[PDB]
Design a protein around this ligand. Sequence first.
Ligand code: HEM
Length: 119
Amino acid sequence: IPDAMIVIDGHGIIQLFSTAAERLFGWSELEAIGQNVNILMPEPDRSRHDSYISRYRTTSDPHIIGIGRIVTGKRRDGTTFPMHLSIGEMQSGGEPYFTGFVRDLTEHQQTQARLQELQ
Ligand code: HEM
């Protein structure tokens, strides 16, 4: 089930960016591949993201890995949107890499908001 998929290294730098992720976030694969993953989210998360990763690497206490969470992401044109995020942990060449699977929930949030406003 291809949804948006992103692989980052232990520093948050993007290694691979699926074509579905390009459609969702507005960045091409080439544009994203050397950027920090924090470019896909707004503040306060953006500036705090590196410490989320560092805190996990030092403690081994997952807050989203193996749990899943609904959050707000940011597209290249500046628009934000709700998405579900799941994180997988992997190893390659001795170093940790993390895989993120994203499911866009904009439609769901809208329908729900629509049903609510019509009482
Ligand atoms: C794009 C919107 C995203 C947002 C808003 C977001 C937000 C967060 C938040 C809020 C935390 C945990 C903070 C906590 O509960 O203390 C976190 C942890 C983490 N995120 Fe992100 N993240 C995003 C995408 C990603 C992606 C795509 C990846 C992997 C490709 C990723 C990799 C990680 C890792 C490895 C951790 C540390 C894990 C642990 O606490 O489980 N994040 N992120």
